[PDB]
Design a protein around this ligand. Structure first.
Ligand SMILES: Nc1ncnc2c1ncn2[C@@H]1O[C@H](CSCC[C@H](N)C(=O)O)[C@@H](O)[C@H]1O
Length: 352
DNA sequence: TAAATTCGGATTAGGAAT
DNA sequence: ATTCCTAATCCGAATTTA
């Protein structure tokens, strides 16, 4: 049974002890191509053991992105990248609630001792929840401090729904541009492209924390001085593309596979307004992307140097109330589609 | 009818006391 | 090996807005 590390610092995080500069990886796991798989860390029993077995028995690297941003994000990363001499993209985002939310100290109670947000999810706190918190604190506004039982109803619900103090006894959840900034994306990365505000919440909560991924992908910069061909599976709003962009790693070609059209619109928008000189190729459903097209694309452009993606975690997240059935759920089973495409790439890159 | 709103517990792990 | 607590958690779906 894989037991998650405590602290969840992986092979080491900036400004913290325990950095490991060398690991031994199984020979069946060696590149080329380099690959990078991501999923949530807190899965049902036995999920990561199944994932590792299908990804060459590489032990996952579990990192909580609270060591990179203000909001926790416990994820497991399986990859065959070198782990020595990583680096972070500058400047790093704000570390604490005080610095991330400057206007917060006007409304923040001193019995709310949070210095760190919980994980950014796809379903946001209710407006009726903000009211039930405002009504609970109302009968104690001329008292210096409300009682204890009134305090932890508010504190437990603020932690449960990731609420920040925005007004007088007003605890409201994060807005999309605040999620964008914490997740390492530039401002208004997901505003246009036909994305409704509701769709912005779901696309953001499902995405990478760019600084964490960029820290891991930073070892690629000395290896490829002329750029890389990238195979992006389950691209989303392009977390890996943004990370590679901030690392100043040229993207000669990006074959993206992402089924949501507004996500594909967000990526093409990002591709043009960053003036990417490379070519972007967008596919929709991974279940219709045949092995022969992969080989066909690899023969035109010369194989992929990196295969990066994160399969759906719908059936693995603890927030799922009706369909948290594990790796064989209808959406998270697309993890084996990731292994399918990756095996095609390895066939040409390394042989047998 | 796209968009917005609301509410709906269980599964893990760990600590600490039997 | 049990019991008992705190604690975090890339969510679905039914319904109403507009
Ligand atoms: N059948 C399918 N084919 C291709 N993509 C799919 C798919 N089913 C779900 N997806 C996509 O897989 C993505 C996983 S979310 C991961 C996206 C990435 N971590 C980011 O930075 O945004 C989702 O955006 C979802 O739309």
């Amino acid at each position: 049974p894989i037991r998650l590390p405590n602290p969840m610092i992986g092979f080491g995080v900036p400004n913290e002890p325990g950095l490991i500069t060398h690991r031994s990886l199984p020979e069946l796991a060696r590149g080329p191509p380099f690959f990078y798989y991501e999923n949530v860390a807190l899965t049902p029993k036995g999920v990561w053991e199944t994932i590792s077995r299908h990804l060459f028995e590489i032990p996952p690297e579990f990192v909580d992105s609270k060591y990179f941003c203000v909001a926790a994000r416990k994820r497991g990363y399986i990859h065959n990248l070198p782990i020595n001499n990583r680096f972070q993209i500058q400047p790093p985002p704000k570390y604490t609630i005080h610095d991330a939310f400057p206007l917060s100290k006007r409304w923040w109670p001193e019995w709310d001792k949070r210095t760190k947000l919980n994980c950014i999810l796809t379903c946001t706190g209710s407006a009726q929840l903000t009211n039930r918190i405002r009504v609970a604190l109302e009968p104690y506004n001329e008292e210096p401090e409300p009682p204890k039982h009134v305090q932890r109803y508010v504190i437990d619900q603020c932690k449960k729904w990731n609420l920040v103090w925005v007004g007088k006894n007003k605890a409201a959840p994060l807005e999309p541009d605040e999620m964008e900034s914490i997740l390492g994306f530039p401002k208004n990365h997901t505003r246009g492209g036909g994305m409704s505000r509701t769709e912005r919440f779901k696309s953001l909560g499902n995405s990478f924390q760019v600084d964490t991924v960029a820290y891991h992908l930073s070892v690629l910069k000395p290896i490829f001085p002329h750029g890389i061909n990238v195979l992006s599976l389950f691209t989303g709003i392009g977390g890996g593309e943004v990370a590679l962009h901030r690392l100043q790693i040229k993207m000669k070609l990006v074959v993206s596979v992402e089924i949501s059209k507004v996500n594909r619109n967000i990526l093409k928008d990002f591709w043009e307004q960053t003036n990417q000189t490379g070519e972007l190729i967008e596919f929709s459903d991974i279940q219709h992307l045949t092995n022969d097209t992969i080989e066909g694309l690899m023969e035109k452009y010369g194989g992929f140097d990196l295969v990066i993606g994160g399969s759906p975690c719908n059936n693995l997240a603890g927030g799922n109330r009706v369909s948290r059935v594990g790796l064989e759920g209808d959406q998270s089973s697309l993890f084996f589609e990731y292994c399918r495409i990756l095996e095609v790439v390895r066939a040409r890159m390394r042989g047998s």
